[PDB]
């Protein structure tokens, strides 16, 4: 019997012995994060995580991953958000993200909290996940900017939001990508990400090497000439325009 690895464009993968139909179904299937080391291992059905236990990929032998289960009883399952439910376990952090980022006061003035790197990493490193409730562009675009501080476009049908009071880490910390502040000279970008718990979402990926405790920033990418944007950004866009 053979093992197969199926990679997503983001560098995450599913791995295991596939069944007769080449499906990722069994009791020893794993999702492996883009670090090629952190894994969620256990029961999957056609690649959907039913019960993934936190594990570390320790080696591969003839293509077969050898895992060690982490202590504790951290278990995860596919739990895609809906329009009204952000997560079944809002306070259960993502184990990959928790080793890479933490939330603290931004270094940007008057910008509240921000997202920071816990350790030094190279370019192109996935740091954090942007999960939220899934609502339409009509709802978002038809309402005041004060309700839209955390809205992120996912594709042409869906916007991801972290509505109050889930924007406080004491109410929701399963993902932290909504905590990244904006910069016109960012060190990170948004990228598509297929997550085994959150489903198809976006991630924050570094553009360049970043140091430990460096603040992570992304360009929010508001339309500058439809600027359809909140005030702090319109202001900031003029400073940016000046420096050029």
């Amino acid at each position: 019997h053979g093992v197969c690895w199926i990679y997503y464009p983001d560098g995450g993968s599913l791995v295991g012995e596939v069944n007769e139909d080449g499906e990722m179904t069994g009791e020893k299937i794993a999702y492996v994060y883009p670090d090629e080391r952190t894994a969620l291992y256990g029961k999957f059905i056609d690649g959907e995580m039913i019960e993934g236990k936190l594990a570390t990929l320790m080696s591969t032998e003839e293509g077969r991953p050898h895992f060690e289960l982490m202590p504790g009883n951290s278990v995860y399952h596919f739990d895609k958000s809906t329009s009204s439910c952000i997560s079944t376990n809002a306070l259960l952090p993502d184990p990959y993200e928790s080793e890479r980022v933490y939330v603290a006061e931004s270094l940007i003035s008057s910008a509240g909290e921000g997202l920071f790197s816990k350790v030094a990493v190279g370019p192109n490193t996935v740091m954090s996940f942007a999960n939220g409730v899934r609502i339409t562009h009509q709802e978002v675009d038809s309402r005041d900017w004060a309700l839209n501080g955390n809205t992120l476009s996912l594709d042409e049908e869906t916007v991801i939001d972290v509505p109050e009071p889930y924007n406080h880490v004491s109410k929701y910390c399963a993902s932290l990508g909504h905590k990244a502040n904006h910069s016109f000279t960012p060190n990170c970008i948004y990228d598509m990400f297929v997550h085994p718990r959150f489903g198809p979402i976006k991630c924050i990926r570094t553009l360049r090497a970043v140091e430990a405790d460096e603040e992570l920033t992304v360009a929010y990418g508001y339309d500058h000439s439809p600027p359809e944007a909140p005030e702090w950004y319109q202001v900031e866009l003029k400073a940016f325009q000046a420096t050029q």
Binding site: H137, V140, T151, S153, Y190, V218, Y220, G221, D223
Partner: peptide, 8 residues
């Protein structure tokens, strides 16, 4: 749109 990262 009043959301981040839309592709215009």
């Amino acid at each position: 749109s009043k959301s981040k990262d839309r592709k215009y």
